[PDB]
Amino acid sequence: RQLIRQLLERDKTPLAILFMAAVVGTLVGLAAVAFDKGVAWLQNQRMGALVHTADNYPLLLTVAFLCSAVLAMFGYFLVRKYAPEAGGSGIPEIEGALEDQRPVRWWRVLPVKFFGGLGTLGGGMVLGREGPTVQIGGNIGRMVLDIFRLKGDEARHTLLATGAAAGLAAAFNAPLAGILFIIEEMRPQFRYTLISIKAVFIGVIMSTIMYRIFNHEVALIDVGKLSDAPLNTLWLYLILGIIFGIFGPIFNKWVLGMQDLLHRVHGGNITKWVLMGGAIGGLCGLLGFVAPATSGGGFNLIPIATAGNFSMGMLVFIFVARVITTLLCFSSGAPGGIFAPMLALGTVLGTAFGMVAVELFPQYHLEAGTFAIAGMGALLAASIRAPLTGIILVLEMTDNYQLILPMIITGLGATLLAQFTGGKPLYSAILARTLAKQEAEQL
Amino acid sequence: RQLIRQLLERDKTPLAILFMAAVVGTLVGLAAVAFDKGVAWLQNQRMGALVHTADNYPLLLTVAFLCSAVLAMFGYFLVRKYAPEAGGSGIPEIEGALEDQRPVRWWRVLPVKFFGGLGTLGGGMVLGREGPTVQIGGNIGRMVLDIFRLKGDEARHTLLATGAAAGLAAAFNAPLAGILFIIEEMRPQFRYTLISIKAVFIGVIMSTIMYRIFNHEVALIDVGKLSDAPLNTLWLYLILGIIFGIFGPIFNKWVLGMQDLLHRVHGGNITKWVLMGGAIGGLCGLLGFVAPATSGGGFNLIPIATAGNFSMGMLVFIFVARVITTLLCFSSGAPGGIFAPMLALGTVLGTAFGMVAVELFPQYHLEAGTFAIAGMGALLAASIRAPLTGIILVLEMTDNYQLILPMIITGLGATLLAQFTGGKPLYSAILARTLAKQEAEQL
């Protein structure tokens, strides 16, 4: 009895952290599958809501405008009222909060992030499902810490990391990438006091279990095992890394220019902001079936594009149509992520390069899908600049683990030429911009 | 012309780091398949020359002692003369050398770690090819630096790291577990600058090419595809993690105790040291015919044990004899690593747990083979204490990527209870003991 009585005292500090990290991993992961089910609902219903309007084409178009636009204004008003920091992606909002720069207001963000991510993802916009859930998990971790009573010196900065690692592993069914987002991408803020990485592991394996209780599949993207990319054709992946690394910092300077462009066209008036957000949501709501691949989050049409079901002109149309609507849906202050549509843009550009290369090179005997799968995790390394989770996320969700060696080449050639071209990581750039705006506002 | 002329002054020393990183990454990776060819030869040739004159059993056994007794007396004498730092593993020596603690002498270490790892590993010893490959990789990373005379301070700490990751990428054909090795296992030594990790990426992807040109296999371990672990049976992997977590610090205290125990046997003299090591090499060479599952690197019995065709008592005898021949081989000062023997003695304990888990309660439809993959990278997580390196190293060379949640569950359960128990990482413990002996030697 004296042994358990002494380990009750000497291990009271680090074991309560893990016992609460299990509660964080349950809470985000239950809230995350509630979010995923609630966004499958009120989007599949609006998709199948052409059954009562089977002939009236303009009266279908206007009702598809309004039925997404009121949902988009419901998403934007909840961002603008009671918690103005819930907009944008949501990852730099806790990348600052792992440091002592940004403050976490869980009692404000956690309702509005849920009911705004619903309102702007079920509206058929071009946001992602992980941007809400990562910040939602971080606020859930700080909420568990504040519901209990701890000092918060190391306990806060291990529970925000556990919440991020258990949100990103719940939005993607990627447990290993949930750890590697904390280790690789959010490196210079995460402390790693060697009892905090066990809290990251606790949160990851307690959130992915709650995902796999509800959503019964094998992977997220249902693309089969492609052909193994042999040797003497990896220089094509090096050239694909060159192309993604050139395009990468050309991208997200567009999102940083558009973030002040749409700031300039509305000023600071909130009625002139929710109306613009509702107009963007209504445009991408009417765009849901007149061109169903130019709209949407992007998890569909990835098995379509990696199978070669599109022509080259169709693919460049899909690319230049998806880029601009990703800009107008992410830069406008919507509560959704950017980490998911970059996967779809990478898919489209990768299979366009594959359909070029399989025609140009007969002496290689290629398939146009391995370039798509490889180039998926290249725009997540040329713009966000985290290639070790960029390759591992698309390994975890597409099951194509045999082409990990072309994936590392097309991630490395992406990040190398994205650093030689003058370009910062996008999340670090957004965080530095909003921190400079915060510290210059109160001067 | 002028564009290249302005290009050469911005990325002046980064491009030199990446070009010599490609040189290190291509020198290693043929210097590892040279190791693998020279260790497959004079092992298959050795056993073939013994079974050539296979007329009588004890006269076969005495020549099976004398061959690989002579190889062990070659290897131990080669470690003791001209290079006394090449003993044991080498990962502790270059983990110290990534700081300013242990000095690198490539001109001594490179021609003797090669020809000592040949003499010990091909001599049927119980130590693998990631010790004498990661040390060779780091020393090649210093050799290319000294030959090309870069002469910097970031250059040394970058090229030693990219040589270490190239050695671990070419040792196990794992391009992911090379980058994930000097991120977690070498975390408090390696500086994670922007141009260093891309030199690691270059050094790993230029070495996996030079491995996969020569070797044609997809993996190293021939476990085809096991069952998917259902959500009912996930607590059993936590119980396996707890068992490996209490076996964690009993091992590597046994290693550290047997190291000074066999140091007390030889005293301090090269003659008794070599006469001990020759007896150990002759013992593990003679064991290659009586019980051949108690020798070698330990890759022969892993697909035998993961398939259900052993017995419980045979697994107990294999594990016991494997431990008594693993401690006595690594702690005797032989140039060989401890990843692959630990994997080979972890899969036996995992399979022994699986054969009990199937038979106590069949109402899970549990295959007893899926615990072998879970128990391979669960003693690495307990003793070496790089769990994200272990659960990636075991999945790179088996391609059983569907139990990636039980991998994290048992890798958590190993290191959690190995932290509640007073255990250290074995490489940090060996490096601390070596640094204490070095600071005690100078006075």
Asked whether B300 and B293 are in contact (CB, 8 A), the reply is yes
Torsion sign, CA atoms B83, B87, B91, B97: negative
C-alpha closest to that of B171 among B431, B425, B396? B396
Of A180, A387, A420, the CB nearest to B11: A420
- The amino acid occupying position B188 is P
CB-based contact B184 A183, cutoff 8 Å: yes
CA-angle at B165, arms to B162 and B169, nearest 5°: 135
Asked whether B174 and B168 are in contact (CB, 8 A), the reply is yes
C-alpha closest to that of B25 among A245, A389, A409? A409
B404 carries a ligand binding annotation: no
Alpha carbon distance A354, A308 (integer Å): 9
Tokens for A378? Answer: 């290249």
Tokens for A72? Answer: 């988009």
Tokens for A296? Answer: 């949407």
CB-based contact B402 A213, cutoff 8 Å: no
CB-based contact B408 A176, cutoff 8 Å: yes
C-alpha closest to that of B372 among B387, B361, B358? B358
CB-based contact B399 A396, cutoff 8 Å: no
Residue B49's domain comprises 1-443
Tally of domains in chain B? 1
Residue B53's contacts (CB-CB under 8 Å, 6 or more residues apart) are: B60, B63
How long a stretch of residues is chain B?
A: 443
Place of tokens 């519901």: A147
**DSSP letter, residue B367:** -
3-state secondary structure of B225: coil
CB contacts, 8 Å: A7 with chain B: 420
Tokens for A315? Answer: 């693919």
Q: What are phi and psi of A51, to 5 degrees?
A: -75, -25
Asked whether B327 and B255 are in contact (CB, 8 A), the reply is yes
Q: Which of B401, B407, B424 to mutate to test the interface with A (most CBs of A within 10 A)?
A: B401
Q: State the resolution, in angstroms.
A: 3.7
Consecutive H or E run containing B234:
helix B234-247
Asked whether B255 and B330 are in contact (CB, 8 A), the reply is yes
CB-based contact B419 A218, cutoff 8 Å: no
Asked whether B87 and B419 are in contact (CB, 8 A), the reply is no
CB-based contact A202 B412, cutoff 8 Å: yes
CB-based contact B408 A183, cutoff 8 Å: no
- This entry's atomic model was obtained through cryo-EM
Asked whether A188 and A386 are in contact (CB, 8 A), the reply is no
Alpha carbon distance B199, B196 (integer Å): 5
CB-based contact A402 B399, cutoff 8 Å: yes
- Chain A nearest-CA residue for B211: A231
Asked whether A305 and A298 are in contact (CB, 8 A), the reply is no
Asked whether A342 and A425 are in contact (CB, 8 A), the reply is no
C-alpha separations of B297 from A58, A201, B131, B253, B314 in Å? 72, 31, 11, 22, 19
C-alpha closest to that of A69 among A287, A298, A259? A287
The 3-class SS string of B374-428 reads HHHCCCHHHHHCCHHHHHHHHHHCCCCCCCHHHHHHHHHHHHHHHHHCCCCCHHH
DSSP A22-55: HHHHHHHHHHHHHHHHHHHTTTHHHHSTTSS-SS
CB contacts, 8 Å: B234 with chain A: 209
Tokens for B442? Answer: 């100078």
CB-based contact A231 B218, cutoff 8 Å: no
C-alpha separations of A74 from A284, A334, B390 in Å? 15, 11, 47
Alpha carbon distance A102, A434 (integer Å): 10
**DSSP letter, residue B230:** P
Alpha carbon distance B350, B353 (integer Å): 5
H helix intervals, A11-129: 12-40, 44-47, 57-80, 92-95, 106-121
Alpha carbon distance B238, B224 (integer Å): 24
Alpha carbon distance A243, A261 (integer Å): 27
Tokens for B41? Answer: 């030869």
CB contacts, 8 Å: A211 with chain B: none
Q: How many CB pairs under 8 A join A and B?
A: 90
Asked whether A208 and B405 are in contact (CB, 8 A), the reply is yes
C-alpha separations of B144 from B111, B141, B165, B169 in Å? 15, 6, 15, 19
B358-377 in b/e form (b: 16+ CB < 10 A) is beeeeeeebbbbbbbbbbbb
Alpha carbon distance B416, B405 (integer Å): 16
Alpha carbon distance B73, B276 (integer Å): 9
The 3-class SS string of A258-285 reads HHHHHHHCCCCCCHHHHHHHHHHHHHHH
Asked whether A183 and A190 are in contact (CB, 8 A), the reply is yes
DSSP A212-226: HHHS--S-SS-----
C-alpha separations of A65 from A59, A183, A283, B226 in Å? 10, 42, 7, 50
Residue A185's contacts (CB-CB under 8 Å, 6 or more residues apart) are: A384, A386, A389, A427
CB contacts, 8 Å: A404 with chain B: 175-176, 396
DSSP A388-439: HHHHHHHHHHH---GGGHHHHHHHHHHHHHHHHSS---HHHHHHHHHHHHHH
- Chain A nearest-CA residue for B419: A195
Q: What are phi and psi of B337, to 5 degrees?
A: -80, -175
Asked whether B205 and A414 are in contact (CB, 8 A), the reply is no
The torsion angle over the Cα atoms of residues A139, A142, A144 and A146, rounded to 10 degrees, is -130
Which residues of A line the annotated binding site for chloride? Answer: 89, 338-339, 427
C-alpha closest to that of A318 among A337, A300, A334? A300
Of A175, A202, A412, the CB nearest to B201: A412
B165-190 in b/e form (b: 16+ CB < 10 A) is bbbbbbbbbbbbbbbbbbbbbbeebb
C-alpha separations of A388 from A56, B171, B176, B358 in Å? 50, 20, 9, 37
Asked whether A393 and A174 are in contact (CB, 8 A), the reply is yes
Q: Which residues of chain A approach chain B closer than 8 Å at the C-beta?
A: 7, 11, 18, 175-176, 179-180, 183-184, 187, 192, 194-195, 198, 201-202, 204-205, 208-209, 212-213, 218, 228, 231, 234, 387-388, 391-392, 395-396, 399, 401-402, 404-405, 408-409, 411-412, 415-416, 419-420
